[PDB]
DNA sequence: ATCAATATCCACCTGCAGATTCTACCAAAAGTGTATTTGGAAACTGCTCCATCAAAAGGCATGTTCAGCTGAATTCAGCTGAACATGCCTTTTGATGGAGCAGTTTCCAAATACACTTTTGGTAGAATCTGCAGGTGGATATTGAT
DNA sequence: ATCAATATCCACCTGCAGATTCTACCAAAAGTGTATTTGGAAACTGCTCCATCAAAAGGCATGTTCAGCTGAATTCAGCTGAACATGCCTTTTGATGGAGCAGTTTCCAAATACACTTTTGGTAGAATCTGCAGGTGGATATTGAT
């Protein structure tokens, strides 16, 4: 190559930027949108398994479970969690915040009368 | 050896027939169904719980329609216990019919 | 007397007397072994067993609503959630009621949305 | 040796990702770093709550097994009425 | 002549009993021993209730002493459990040894 | 032979005849033990001793010498076990205990 | 000032008596409305109640038994009118 | 002339109301206003003088109560004075609004 | 800092209002003494269902980096509630018929209890559907840089 | 306001899990038909416990003035979200031994079911008293001003 157009010319194309991010909070609301459309659960089924033998073994040894004992203990424990939040983020917000903080999740049971 | 059975009833056949009603061509889960099962013994238990108490209150031994009655209209918020007591009285008095 | 145990006539259900799919035997038996009251008249059964089968329907009409916007056929808990909570009367009926594999109703505080 | 392996800490299995996920459900957009201590806080204590009603249900009973009926009944005690595992 | 009755079952002198029991020189207003009669039916409603319970789940006719202590385990918090168990546990072993 | 009650022999101050009565005609069961009401009974009077006690203490504390709706009040949400045994409880005529927000005490 | 409503007859330093007794310090002028409002969703619901019963018993006076197991239905549980 | 400073009286009368137990609503508006409820469920009804009596009691009680939460949720949010928003929130996670 | 105004205590003091002890009257409990019954425990045992092992693979959890933007701190004004001084309109406080809430007696519709006859819902085992969950791929929005 | 970069649809596809479908078996239901028991509607009637009036009483509505508190506006340190790399540990498919529920028969301890006797807690005046709430006096501690 010695004709006349495409000397040196490697700044061509130059439209093409670096790399990509999404702000803070877009993913937060992707998420939500996620969670609030599925009903899967949301604890790793076997680490649940243990803290329920867990505890249960604290207040009294040598004891069985149905498989579906547990399942029920995680569809209310999850159940009472995710409710908890939502009035926990109502409590933030009431603070003008956006950011649900233990003040907040106090404040909900406080409330509710669980720690009043 | 022997032959060792269990049964337990549920309102499953039930539902499933009302189910047929409104919705003819849907269907069902077991898990579904299952809740469904819950939620009529739950009603069935708060309903007849009421009317036990209402029966004591007044130094009634006997639960009848009339209990039942005021038992629904205590537990079920405003339109839907309206329409509850209109089936109930319905059933009532056309059973009554039969002589 | 016994001549009465035979030929002619044969029986019918309370429910189909009634006029109702739900068992009015089942229900007044159940009232019975349930320890409400001593006595049980007749048309306990008949009333309990009527609204019972008419609550069931309002739910099931409503989930198998939420059935069809999703286009699906088989209700599925999802379906009975759905109908229940957007329902006033029947979420407050059931205000402390937890149907397992339900989720919850999808809905982002306003002051959460960007700018 | 016979069998028996030692259970401890089974709190940490509460992963910081498994609360966010419910926080979401909850519809919460943002978190402090204090909220997952705290959440395993408020979880060990509900259920400690319904395990003892539950298993005080199974002692009744003269039985080694906590049923799901011991966790409905606990669970109806408590005010949390469960649909799904045989009401 | 007259011929009248009604009758008012009330827990109020087994209530006055236990207080010049703690308190021998303390008296009680007529509206408080109202509250405290009013709890005593509360308490008795609830624990009967539980034991009512326990009888259903494990289909048994019969509300003996043991549904009443698991009703009490359930109903009560820690401490007051514990002594009510005991002071229960005694009443009934004291009415057995001796007749 | 002479009769002497049942809470006698279970050694309470509690009528046995009378929770035995009460839960038979409660349709808690079908049938009713022979311990039960006593057990029931033992019960109920313990607990009524607790609150007694605990009022009467209150009494005292007023330089009070008969027992009012407020003494029992006093006494009860100031125990954290009966407090939470009668959460769900509202005392005619107790009103409540003194606690104000620190956040609203005087700035000096 | 003579025509009156009788929600309107719950008076504001009456409010201001309760809202004392529960600790508040200083309070929005707009408090009041709101606390009628709430008042009267109380009574409300309670009372349907108490009237239930009352209709149930066949009668036309409202006994203190009514309203005390309509409140404990609402889980208010009321102590010194009844057991 | 003599002033007390704002919040001082109100202070004193938190001491006051909060060591009493005599009810705080007048007897005859509160009398009226049951009775005006009431009638829109049946007509032509009497009142046991100890059921208003009974009504009151649990009305007042409520309400300090849900002063008392109200009161929490003002402070919660860097506040002294309770506002609407503090009554509603309150409400809201007691279950009685949401 | 020094009053000067109020509010808040403490010690008494005394009347009335609502606890007391007093007596006598039953019916209703509750105790006792037989008789007939039965719930549910013990003693097997058949047969779900739980605990436990294994072993391969993929979906998640952990840990770290980087900086957008959120909470928290500071400041400052307008303006919302608090404190205040009393007349006035309504809420207390009692008396006075009478409406109902209740004791009481009666009488039949309705509930039981008992014993056959009979219809029906639960289930164990196999056979055949069939919504639909994932897998794609590519058309359709929704962000975020610029 | 474009374009690029990802996420989000959304209908098409079909392989498997799980509904829906009979075959039959059977036991507990549920129903049908005399006989016996009784709970409560129903009519009355007395006796409280209400709703109504009047006079007699004590809090509320008002309007002024200013302290103080709530928000608004500004700033900025860093927490917390987004993304990325790596390696574990949950999730899954299977299979086994055996604890331990859950049937079944079988009795006796305990419980119901009358009947008879004794006692006792509730009630209706009737008289007796007593704890203590308002009232006083006067000391002293807060509160707010200068
Ligand atoms: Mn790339
Ligand atoms: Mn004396
Ligand atoms: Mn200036
Ligand atoms: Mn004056
Ligand atoms: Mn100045
Ligand atoms: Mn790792």
């Known amino acids: 190559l010695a004709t006349k157009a495409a000397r040196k010319s490697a700044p061509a194309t130059g439209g093409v930027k670096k790399p990509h991010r999404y702000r803070p909070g877009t993913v937060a609301l992707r998420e939500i949108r996620r969670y609030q459309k599925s009903t899967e659960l949301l604890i790793r089924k076997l680490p649940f398994q243990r803290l329920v033998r867990e505890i249960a073994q604290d207040f009294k040894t040598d004891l069985r479970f149905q498989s579906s004992a547990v399942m029920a203990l995680q569809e209310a424990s999850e159940a009472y969690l995710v409710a908890l939040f939502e009035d926990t983020n109502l409590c933030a917000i009431h603070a003008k915040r956006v950011t649900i903080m233990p003040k907040d999740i106090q404040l909900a049971r406080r409330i509710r009368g669980e720690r009043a | 050896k022997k032959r060792r059975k269990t049964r337990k009833e549920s309102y499953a056949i039930y539902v499933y ?33 009421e009317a036990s108490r209402l029966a004591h209150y007044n130094k009634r031994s006997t639960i009848t329609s009339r209990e039942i009655q005021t038992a629904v209209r205590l537990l079920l918020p405003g339109e839907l216990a309206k329409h509850a007591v209109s089936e109930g009285t319905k059933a009532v008095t056309k059973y009554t019919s039969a002589k | 007397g016994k001549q009465g145990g035979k030929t002619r006539a044969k029986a019918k259900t309370r429910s189909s007397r009634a006029g109702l799919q739900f068992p009015v035997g089942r229900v007044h038996r159940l009232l019975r072994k349930g320890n409400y009251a001593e006595r049980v008249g007749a048309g306990a059964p008949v009333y309990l067993a009527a609204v019972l089968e008419y609550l069931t329907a309002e739910i099931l009409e409503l989930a198998g609503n939420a059935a069809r916007d999703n286009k699906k056929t088989r209700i599925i808990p999802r379906h009975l959630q759905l109908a229940v909570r957007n329902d006033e009367e029947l979420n407050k009926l059931l205000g402390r009621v937890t149907i397992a594999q339900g989720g919850v109703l999808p809905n982002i505080q306003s002051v959460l949305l960007p700018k | 040796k016979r069998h028996r392996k030692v259970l401890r800490d089974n709190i940490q299995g509460i992963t910081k990702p498994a609360i966010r996920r419910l926080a979401r459900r909850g519809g919460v957009k943002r978190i402090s770093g204090l909220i997952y201590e705290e959440t395993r806080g408020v979880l060990k204590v509900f259920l400690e709550n319904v395990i003892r009603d539950a298993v005080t249900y199974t002692e009744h009973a003269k039985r080694k097994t906590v049923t799901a009926m011991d966790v409905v009944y606990a669970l109806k005690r408590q005010g949390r009425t469960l649909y799904g595992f045989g009401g």
Request: overall charge positive; glycine content about 6%.
């Open chain 2, 17 to 49: 027939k009302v189910l047929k009603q409104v919705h003819p061509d849907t269907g069902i889960s077991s898990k579904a169904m299952s809740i469904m099962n819950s939620f009529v013994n739950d009603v069935f238990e708060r309903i007849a719980g």
